[PDB]
Amino acid sequence: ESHVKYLDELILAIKDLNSGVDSKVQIKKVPSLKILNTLIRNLKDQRRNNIMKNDTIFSKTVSALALLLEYNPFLLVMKDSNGNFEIQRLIDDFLNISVLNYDNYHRIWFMRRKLGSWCKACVEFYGKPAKFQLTAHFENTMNLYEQALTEVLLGKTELLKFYDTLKGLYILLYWFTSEYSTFGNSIAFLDSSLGFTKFDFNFQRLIRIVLYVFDSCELAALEYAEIQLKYISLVVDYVCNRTISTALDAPALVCCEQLKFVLTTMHHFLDNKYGLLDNDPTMAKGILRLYSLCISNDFSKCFVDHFPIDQWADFSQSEHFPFTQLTNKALSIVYFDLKRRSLPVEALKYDNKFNIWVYQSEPDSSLKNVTSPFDDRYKQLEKLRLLVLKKFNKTERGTLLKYRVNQLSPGFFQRAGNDFKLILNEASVSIQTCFKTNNITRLTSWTVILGRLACLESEKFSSTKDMDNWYVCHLCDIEKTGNPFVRINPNRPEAAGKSEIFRILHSNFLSHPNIDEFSESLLSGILFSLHRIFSHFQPPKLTDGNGQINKSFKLVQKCFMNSNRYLRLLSTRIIPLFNISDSHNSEDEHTATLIKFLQSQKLPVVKENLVIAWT
Amino acid sequence: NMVPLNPNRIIPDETSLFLESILLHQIIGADLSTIEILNRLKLDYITEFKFKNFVIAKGAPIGKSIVSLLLRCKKTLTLDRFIDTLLEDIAVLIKEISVHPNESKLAVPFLVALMYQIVQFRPSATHNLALKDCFLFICDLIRIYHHVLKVPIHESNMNLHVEPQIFQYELIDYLIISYSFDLLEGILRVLQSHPKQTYMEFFDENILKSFEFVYKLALTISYKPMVNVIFSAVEVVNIITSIILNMDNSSDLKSLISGSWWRDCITRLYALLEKEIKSGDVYNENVDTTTLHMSKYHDFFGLIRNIGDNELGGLISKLIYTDRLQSVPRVISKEDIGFTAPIIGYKMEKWLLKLKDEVLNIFENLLMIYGDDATIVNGEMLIHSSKFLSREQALMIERYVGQDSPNLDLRCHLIEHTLTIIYRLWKDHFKQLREEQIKQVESQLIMSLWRFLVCQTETVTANEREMRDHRHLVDSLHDLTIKDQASYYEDAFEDLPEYIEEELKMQLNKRTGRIMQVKYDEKFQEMARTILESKSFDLTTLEEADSLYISMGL
Amino acid sequence: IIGADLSTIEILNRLKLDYITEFKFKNFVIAKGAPIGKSIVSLLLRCKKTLTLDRFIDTLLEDIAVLIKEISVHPNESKLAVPFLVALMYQIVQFRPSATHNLALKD
Numbered sequence A: 001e002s003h004v005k006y007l008d009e010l011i012l013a014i015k016d017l018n019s020g021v022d023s024k025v026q027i028k029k030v031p032s033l034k035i036l037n038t039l040i041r042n043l044k045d046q047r048r049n050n051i052m053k054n055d056t057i058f059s060k061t062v063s064a065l066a067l068l069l070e071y072n073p074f075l076l077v078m079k080d081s082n083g084n085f086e087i088q089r090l091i092d093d094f095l096n097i098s099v100l101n102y103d104n105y106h107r108i109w110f111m112r113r114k115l116g117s118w119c120k121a122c123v124e125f126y127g128k129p130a131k132f133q134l135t136a137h138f139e140n141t142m143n144l145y146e147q148a149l150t151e152v153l154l155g156k157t158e159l160l161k162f163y164d165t166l167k168g169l170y171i172l173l174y175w176f177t178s179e180y181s182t183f184g185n186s187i188a189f190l191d192s193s194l195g196f197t198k199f200d201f202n203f204q205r206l207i208r209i210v211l212y213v214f215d216s217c218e219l220a221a222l223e224y225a226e227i228q229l230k231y232i233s234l235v236v237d238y239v240c241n242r243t244i245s246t247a248l249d250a251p252a253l254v255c256c257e258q259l260k261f262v263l264t265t266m267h268h269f270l271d272n273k274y275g276l277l278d279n280d281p282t283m284a285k286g287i288l289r290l291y292s293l294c295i296s297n298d299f300s301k302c303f304v305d306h307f308p309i310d311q312w313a314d315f316s317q318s319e320h321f322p323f324t325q326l327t328n329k330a331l332s333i334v335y336f337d338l339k340r341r342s343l344p345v346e347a348l349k350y351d352n353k354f355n356i357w358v359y360q361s362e363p364d365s366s367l368k369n370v371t372s373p374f375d376d377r378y379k380q381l382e383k384l385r386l387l388v389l390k391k392f393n394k395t396e397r398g399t400l401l402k403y404r405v406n407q408l409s410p411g412f413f414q415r416a417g418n419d420f421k422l423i424l425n426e427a428s429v430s431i432q433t434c435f436k437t438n439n440i441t442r443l444t445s446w447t448v449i450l451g452r453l454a455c456l457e458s459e460k461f462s463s464t465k466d467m468d469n470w471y472v473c474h475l476c477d478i479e480k481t482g483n484p485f486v487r488i489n490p491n492r493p494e495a496a497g498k499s500e501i502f503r504i505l506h507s508n509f510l511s512h513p514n515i516d517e518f519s520e521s522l523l524s525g526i527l528f529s530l531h532r533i534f535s536h537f538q539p540p541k542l543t544d545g546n547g548q549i550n551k552s553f554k555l556v557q558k559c560f561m562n563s564n565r566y567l568r569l570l571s572t573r574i575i576p577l578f579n580i581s582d583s584h585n586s587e588d589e590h591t592a593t594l595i596k597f598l599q600s601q602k603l604p605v606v607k608e609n610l611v612i613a614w615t
Numbered sequence B: 001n002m003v004p005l006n007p008n009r010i011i012p013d014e015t016s017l018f019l020e021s022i023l024l025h026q027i028i029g030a031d032l033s034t035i036e037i038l039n040r041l042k043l044d045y046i047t048e049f050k051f052k053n054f055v056i057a058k059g060a061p062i063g064k065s066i067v068s069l070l071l072r073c074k075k076t077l078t079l080d081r082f083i084d085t086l087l088e089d090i091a092v093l094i095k096e097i098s099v100h101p102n103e104s105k106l107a108v109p110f111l112v113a114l115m116y117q118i119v120q121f122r123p124s125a126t127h128n129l130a131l132k133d134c135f136l137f138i139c140d141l142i143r144i145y146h147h148v149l150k151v152p153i154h155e156s157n158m159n160l161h162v163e164p165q166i167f168q169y170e171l172i173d174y175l176i177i178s179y180s181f182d183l184l185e186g187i188l189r190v191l192q193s194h195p196k197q198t199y200m201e202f203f204d205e206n207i208l209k210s211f212e213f214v215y216k217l218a219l220t221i222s223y224k225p226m227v228n229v230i231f232s233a234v235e236v237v238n239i240i241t242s243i244i245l246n247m248d249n250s251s252d253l254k255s256l257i258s259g260s261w262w263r264d265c266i267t268r269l270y271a272l273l274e275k276e277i278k279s280g281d282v283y284n285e286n287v288d289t290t291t292l293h294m295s296k297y298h299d300f301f302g303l304i305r306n307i308g309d310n311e312l313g314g315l316i317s318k319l320i321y322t323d324r325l326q327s328v329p330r331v332i333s334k335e336d337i338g339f340t341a342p343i344i345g346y347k348m349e350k351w352l353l354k355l356k357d358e359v360l361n362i363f364e365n366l367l368m369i370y371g372d373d374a375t376i377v378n379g380e381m382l383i384h385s386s387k388f389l390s391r392e393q394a395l396m397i398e399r400y401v402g403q404d405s406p407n408l409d410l411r412c413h414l415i416e417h418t419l420t421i422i423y424r425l426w427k428d429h430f431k432q433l434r435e436e437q438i439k440q441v442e443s444q445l446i447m448s449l450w451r452f453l454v455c456q457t458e459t460v461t462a463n464e465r466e467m468r469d470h471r472h473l474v475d476s477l478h479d480l481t482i483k484d485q486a487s488y489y490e491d492a493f494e495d496l497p498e499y500i501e502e503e504l505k506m507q508l509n510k511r512t513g514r515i516m517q518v519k520y521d522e523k524f525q526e527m528a529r530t531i532l533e534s535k536s537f538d539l540t541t542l543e544e545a546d547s548l549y550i551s552m553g554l
Numbered sequence C: 001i002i003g004a005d006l007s008t009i010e011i012l013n014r015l016k017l018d019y020i021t022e023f024k025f026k027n028f029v030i031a032k033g034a035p036i037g038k039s040i041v042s043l044l045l046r047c048k049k050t051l052t053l054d055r056f057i058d059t060l061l062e063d064i065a066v067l068i069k070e071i072s073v074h075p076n077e078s079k080l081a082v083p084f085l086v087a088l089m090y091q092i093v094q095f096r097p098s099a100t101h102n103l104a105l106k107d
């Protein structure tokens, strides 16, 4: 409010002490370091009660500190001469603000990922004199919290000290439950990759320890239910992010033992009537996410083993499942889906109210939360529920190019669709009509669709294929070893000779009067599309003799001497496609054309793609 | 203000939970549980077995003898005694099932997987001398099952593929080998979970000798490699170097270690890292030692990770007749296995990129072990890591940017991490870095640095607008990924308050730049700068450095 | 039982039923040549994780009761499982009479 202007001047004061030029990382300790008092002020104006509740002015407050540490890696390793570096004093002070903002998932994710930036790449300047001086300290405060966890058994524990001991344990869990991208190999128990860390078994120890603590304690507090839902949120978040996380298929897990751990953990949670609170979708989210992981894979039997549900039925009540209404609704939906795939589909039928298959229901109703949405702006919840309802329908499978054309031209496939020439008609009428000058993004989407669709045109005569059964390219997107230019075909079809998509390409793109300004984006996209077309297709004659560079070799010259290196290194890639054909490069004349072209660049920055183009 | 205790804390019987987990333990892919498959097993050559009141008759149900032992020792022992009782008893069981000429060893994979489930259930109570005994048992067990990892590179010209096309014995001992190495990995991670004062009970010379033999057996040179057991064998060394780093008395361990063990490991690591990852010939059988290719005839999940598709899953179930007591295997004709989606190839590439990440990771770890110089901190991690960095940058730029596979980001994270592997080797370990070997790699090192020094120009990005067009071009797969995560699998990814999608439109864009090979992070550009510019070695002269500065401008 | 070699569950493992080609009452699927005691121990381990003691008991009581029932009411079926099922059910009942419920006793 009054100090957001102070933060706006403060980021300018940070960028002022950058360097004499724009080149600044400055990893070492220089013998002005006057930003140390500001570094102190970043956290001494933070532990306060008034406007930390506001989101963005707190976000910029911690983000200016993030940019300061981003441009100054020597600030962690400055040797705060008590016994260590200052980063150990940084972590617990950071933890105080995170435990004041323990509950807001945005506020803790935004803090933990920037701490991951502060630890993963900043310690790498020093390593062994500092890596073990902080990866020990993480386990030191971890050991302190799990040590203090045990004296609540003997009952002499406090109340708020109990609370923030549990909460600090929770946040120390949550940091290390992150993905590999946030915390890399900077911390010595996350040193091992392949979904398989030292944090795995130590975490499976400490979660059983806090289960033992929860069975030891006896408290029905509302806030205890609130912090009780947090740990099951953490146990589903620990197993979600270690999945492989593919494009549109369900993200496959890596460790069936970690799966069984989270399943049996939340099952033992629910068995002891744990974690009940009003209007709280958290357990429902966990159940639905894990069932979404275990829809129809091999782990579905593992789900029905290590989380059984059959025994809480009570069919003959409006209160169907006991615990908390929306979570019990989610449980009913999971039970319904399990029953749906257990029963044969002849008993099932789809009612076309929500178009989902449903069996012969009940003598009573008992089917009100099965298919209805149940939410108070619970958007991820109903999308989970609608995926659970929709995935059984055996509908059209998710595909890359089909998702992209549904994103771009919505509702195209209310027709034949997989018929080939009509999507050519739609892309052609778009690339003739629906642009004036504002689609400097949408036309790039159009041409990347054209680049994949030209590959699809090449995939006929490869009389089997279809719109759906083509995720990626069997020639450009997959690759083999050795010389890739043996796999390409000499007598492949021509671009202008056969492919009407290249006729369209030459119509708009290769004849547009403002090739000199498309954009870097649209030049890159037309380079990608031309790359795929001349990969799958023979390029035309580059020169007949009357000047006459064929509007694409012209694009090679335009993007080849370009100011940016990316379009240089992309425009070099389409060059050997010119170097091979029959009936164009049969007697090595396009060969000598490219030779005397490559002999004609003494420009210093074009040496890189020049030499690569030679190779 | 004290929280009240629970007067009837029902501590569950942990050995009952462990026993129940044993009984319902089923591997991923087969129909029956593992115990029940063992119930479907006999052994008609060992006409009687007994070690310690573990009587097995001739046509006896083997898993019935197991569950007799289980229920008997449940009433008697506490948890660790129950564990290592099962460990040594099933170990002796596996032992004399192995050492017999006419005996089929179909029980052995399920016994090994059973024993793995025994070990990994409670590592807190599992005892390290039992780990040592079981560990040495698996090591000499694999030197018993010797000829599996020693099938030759090429067949003869008259090595006919006329054959009964059988797969049952091959499936048996592939599962034996793979589950064995998986168990070695499990032993060492639970031994890692054992505290940082308690390793000398596990470690002696025989540990290192047996693993050194089986490691040379695993990362083979003149034989066809099994990519499965390569994963396990390098993860073992990862756990080894990790606990060497994370103990205080590393001196006793490294004094137990002869440097021959190091320099025999590191050569096979170099020969592994100098292989290639190409999707179109993963599941093809091709030239050796260049293509970690994950052969079709061993394609299942494994005990820790789910490495493939597990095409062999129902074949594990059809290993047995399931209505009969037998020891001979049920039929698998070998070529009935085997065009829909090379996403299988892409995820196998994802595994192999994580593998090469682990290789350079343990290189990093051993450098941090030997901060001081030694026989193996000797400069070849400039050569081999620089060759890897240079090739995975050059044909990255040539082949991958615009190939829209999910593996692009991790493949260009490999170079991002081995840059630091070059970097701290350069800065902190310059003392051994010989004048000859830098000239052995003078081209590729300086060129690999320059491929980051070229990224300080910054004339591609400069905004938000066209960069998201470029991530539509190449990074629509991460768009799919983040829409699935933002729509299902993240608590913080809903009702975004206009500071956190700001972070998104920062980080997706720097990520897709890092894919597009221009605009790396400035710290990585600085780390490439402070080697080439640094006067610790005359990489360039000043009249040769400007010949590279002009190749940006400057 | 006193006199036979194997345990009762283990004898049930040696049992199938090739006339009732499928049985199911409440997720108690028994196939045609399925090992019957294997289906029992599937039920046992499944209801162990879920139910408390009396619910586990009368679950086993009614399930094995329905099992004995349709093994009985069939003309071509041999009823060799039935004595071991009855003795099994007896062992189920008499173990803890304190928790065993009287309506289950009545049924």
Ligand SMILES: [Zn+2]
Pocket: A452, A455, A473, A474, A475, A476, A477, A532, A536
């Ligand atoms: Zn293509």
